[PDB]
Design a protein around this ligand. Structure first.
Ligand SMILES: CCC(CC)CN(C[C@@H](O)[C@H](Cc1ccccc1)NC(=O)O[C@H]1CO[C@H]2OCC[C@H]21)S(=O)(=O)c1ccc([C@@H](O)CO)cc1
Lengths: 99, 99
């Protein structure tokens, strides 16, 4: 589909057997999801934005479905105020910017 | 153009007669640029991101050309980690997400 930007580009995602709303975010290198208790090993990471850094848990090879499009890659889990689909997964669903 | 997302969507902007690099950021409501001198009146404002809130100067109705496309809108100046172009201007240049 084509998503205009009059409002936040929120879409439904499926991750860890749960459905969530998340931003398709070209400004994020990686995908950052609100606190959730995923199984498996993880590595500590810190990511910086407006306001400073937050601590997140980096999980690798996680399957995410975005609007019925399947992807697999890294997801960072931490106290983000919003679920963020980053470029690491946006490329896997064929997402481009167009103007 | 059509912009793929294997690399950061960085583009050249012109604002206040000066060229700069900026990130096209669909996860940003607003456009926030790093500290710079801009002519005209401004008002102190706050904006929040993934790490908390910062103080910015709000410049309204500013002329800004993004990758050859003109916009006139609000520009917030403050300690953002990166120059970002947000939806308030992305809509003006006709930018959409497509997949
Ligand atoms: C380019 C640097 C920053 C942005 C300065 C990139 N961020 C994405 C950005 O889309 C962010 C998303 C967002 C966060 C909180 C609330 C709502 C949206 N939007 C944002 O701050 O918008 C501001 C401006 O407009 C307002 O609307 C929304 C808030 C206001 S991030 O989340 O901090 C981040 C940092 C590092 C990584 C790692 O992967 C390495 O990249 C991934 C993601």
């Amino acid at each position: 589909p084509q998503i205009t930007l009059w409002k936040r580009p929120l879409v439904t995602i499926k991750i860890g057997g749960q459905l969530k709303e998340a931003l398709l975010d070209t400004g994020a290198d990686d995908t950052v999801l609100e606190e959730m208790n995923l199984p498996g090993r993880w590595k500590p990471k810190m990511i910086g934005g407006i306001g400073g850094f937050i601590k997140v848990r980096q999980y690798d090879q996680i399957l995410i479905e975005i609007c019925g499009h399947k992807a697999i890659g890294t997801v960072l889990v931490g106290p983000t105020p919003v679920n963020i689909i980053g470029r690491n997964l946006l490329t896997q669903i064929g997402c481009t910017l167009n103007f």
